[PDB]
Symmetry: D2
Subunit: 250 residues, 4 copies
């Protein structure tokens, strides 16, 4: 009776907040993770303490390779194995780091990681979700700043642009199956763990609405809306949740 959702990169930060809010809404959840095993298992424990048998973890590397289609099929299969259905896919997992055009990872590894996590894995996950098929939908975590990108982040930005293309192409192609495909695009939300406080404050000061970053819960709220019955005519839409950041000129 309860619907089920897969959330990628769900052990921490925004993906954790999405998994938590879906669970609070009544979903059973697959918490996908790559390296954060302890955090993933800890979240599943918390959710299961709340309602038994409503959360599982599923480990996978979402870097592009010739076995990525199998890994993505397994993530979807894990939801059917645990819960007998898969109603919602949230493509949240993402690699993010600079790749300067002018000069420990080879460039082909950087392509595989940045384009794999942000674009190819979402595509393969979408394929597997659709092939295995109420209120079915997919939500892709996009980036409100894709047209005003950070300096030296070309591969990341290429991946996020590709994810916009996937959102639109899959919304078109999956509409006759009743599957909606939409996006949520943060501006600045939870800042990278590696970033110093002074730099975090630099970015906070740029946001018109409150001079602060989005909480993870604020991003999750837009995901909840798009999967809800209140969004049943919405497909191919990307909702910015950016406090007006993308409207601010240089």
């Amino acid at each position: 009776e309860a619907p089920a959702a897969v959330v990628t990169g769900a052990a921490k930060r925004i993906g954790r907040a999405i998994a938590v809010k879906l669970h609070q809404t009544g979903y059973r959840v697959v918490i996908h993770y790559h390296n954060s095993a302890e955090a993933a298992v800890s979240l599943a424990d918390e959710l299961n303490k709340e309602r038994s048998n409503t959360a599982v973890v599923c480990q996978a590397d979402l870097t592009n390779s010739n076995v990525l289609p199998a890994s993505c099929e397994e993530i979807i299969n894990s939801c059917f194995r645990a819960f007998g259905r898969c109603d919602v896919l949230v493509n949240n997992a993402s690699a993010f780091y600079p790749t300067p055009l002018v000069q420990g990872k080879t460039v082909e590894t950087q392509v595989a990681e940045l384009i794999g996590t942000n674009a190819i894995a979402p595509f393969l996950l979408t394929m597997s979700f659709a092939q295995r098929q109420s209120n079915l939908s997919i939500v892709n975590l996009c980036d409100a700043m894709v047209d005003q990108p950070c300096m030296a982040f070309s591969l990341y930005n290429m991946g996020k642009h590709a994810l916009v293309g996937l959102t639109q192409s899959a919304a078109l192609e999956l509409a006759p199956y009743g599957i909606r495909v939409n996006g949520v695009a943060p501006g600045v939300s939870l800042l990278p763990v590696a970033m110093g406080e002074e730099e975090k404050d630099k970015w906070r000061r740029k946001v018109p609405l409150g001079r602060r970053e989005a909480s993870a819960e604020q991003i999750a709220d837009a995901v909840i809306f798009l999967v809800s019955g209140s969004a049943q005519y919405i497909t191919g839409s990307i909702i910015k949740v950016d406090g007006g950041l993308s409207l601010v000129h240089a």
Copy 2:
């Protein structure tokens, strides 16, 4: 105690559905109308039967003129008079008709209606709303998902709707320091113009990827409800398409 909302063009169709759903969410509402007095009062009666003294009507022509600024100030003022506050402005009223570039309203009348109602009145209402201002204050503008693939011979209408996107962005930036969010909802085909023939209505319905049907007014209202809610408190300057995928469909 209860927040209050102004909805322009609220007597019928999409504006009515928005007013109904805001009311159901707990708002007190000003139902603005131009020509549709009977329908406006009928809605106010229905809402007041549910919760007494929670719905008022306000007449105004939203055509651009020397008096449009005073009329817009009165709409906002009516909310403050009735309810003591104005938390939400929904710019829903619109005129829609063709204005061919190559050839009984003069062109400058068409300007005053299409650009006035669809862009200048939202601008003046936004000024009045902001001037009169914990809280969750926002404005929602009814945009058009087809603004970049416009209907043939609708240049003035399309100009007004593009101007409304500009207002949404400019006002979101300028009002963010006041905690006033400014967002849009962009329908594709929703309730077809009453004048449109049944065969032409079906032609459009058949192009929509999602179920080959128009949006109900209630689906449009659901997006408005989200944007005014606490679930959207970091969202400003965003326009949510509610179009069943229609804008994605090539020629």
Copy 3:
């Protein structure tokens, strides 16, 4: 009779003059429209006529919206036919630009008439008159703004007018395509800074431009107009070319 002819609105100075000059150098006869800048307009027409006799005229009009604006726009197009017997190109360059804050000597209705009139309604009415007068490589070029999605604070009416001009560009490209009239736009970021602006403030904006940390010259903007009216753009309609040195790509 066989050199083509162009109307350039707001052509006495700055970008509009550069467009008129470059069109003239390409072989066009030109109508130099102007509002207040009579001395500068006549001085330009005299220069162009010295270079080739009877190839430049001036035409005065206020492009503020009013119930007479349609007649004024009809008259601008008529001046081109009166002088040159044809009108091949329309460049909508004239523009009012000033802040209109949402929270507090012109009335708001004057500000609406000026900012929306010059930037949007006059281009629309000129587009109507241009199209209706037609009997070649016919086109319209609208001067847009690369920063319309990242607008200056407190410029809502200006930004509304430039957004409306994008809508006109696309609507008119669609509707006039059957008549062989192409309709395109050129969108500067920062080009010639306002005459009233001090050097320090100019340098603040210059420093934001990735390509050279400098504003576009007037000639650089005119170069993109010249391309869009040329035979090298015969399949281009409904396109807006940014000429902004990357400015619109730069985040906050």
Copy 4:
């Protein structure tokens, strides 16, 4: 050594050929990159060298993504410096295009490698190699984009993803390379040269959708926009994508 030089990928046929011809007519020396079309690439180089000796060479490479793609792309740029002593212009034109339906003899990872490699990864690697070699002059890159990226063909998700990635590259590289004086722009066709084997009755279905003339763009019309973007008339233009689509993208369903 005074004439500038350009690399054009996928230049043996169709749009890339017309770009290579127009660049040569403008005074550029050209590297004609090709993958499978050797005879046509060599025929073009010989035609161009007959017009002006030692102004055209060919360079073969597969632009599918793989472990060797970065080296291949470095080699393409290197070929221009070895032939002509300079590389002023890069045109990323080569492209794979075919449907990849989401719902059900190439594996899906081959389709990823081909559609994302040709349309996006190879342009990125070529852009890296071009810039690293440059770390009077008018250096620029032109990417062949697609005016219909937001109204895509049904069941072309991987192709559309690659073309959206190419918009991202055009913008990100324009920003990052602007300090080096390298401009980065795009030209976005709607419908241009159709497949010759496509029935005329199907070609006409697409032609009739185009507002401006109810016909597809010639390859030369697309090349004309590339020529403008590399020219001295575009020296303040970077990060711009010029649609050359006859109004097709403005037409609703």
